[PDB]
Amino acid sequence: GMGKGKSAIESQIRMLKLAKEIVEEVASSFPNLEEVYIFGSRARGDYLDTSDIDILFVFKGIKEMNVFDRMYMVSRFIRGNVDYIVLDEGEKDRVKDKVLFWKREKGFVLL
């Protein structure tokens, strides 16, 4: 039965809603944002109520953008107990164990 308690579930809801707000802003700012994934413990299931949420932003056409330029693309949108990675479309397989959160052609998944 209910392997996650009330506090963990409420934190999952709250963290997904914060990720949604951040993605809405990033997606409105970059036409080349293509997909967003949740990775880490909140994607896998081994999270605590205090766990951060990890967001993978996947953009088209940034293969040549260095890691500092990539960070600068989303830095100002990040707030709360959130960590992130920015990858090109061709590099997204580098993060295993992830959940599709948003896609340009789908909007948000389950939200």
UniProtKB/TrEMBL annotation:
Every Polymerase nucleotidyl transferase domain range: 20-77
Taxonomic superkingdom: Archaea
CDD domains: NT_KNTase_like
UniProt cross-references to InterPro entries, sorted A to Z: NT_sf (IPR043519), Polymerase_NTP_transf_dom (IPR002934), Type_VII_TA_antitoxin (IPR052548)
Single Gene Ontology MF annotation: nucleotidyltransferase activity
Transmembrane segments annotated in the record for this chain: none
SUPFAM superfamilies: Nucleotidyltransferase (SSF81301)
Pfam families: NTP_transf_2 (PF01909)
Full protein name: Polymerase nucleotidyl transferase domain-containing protein
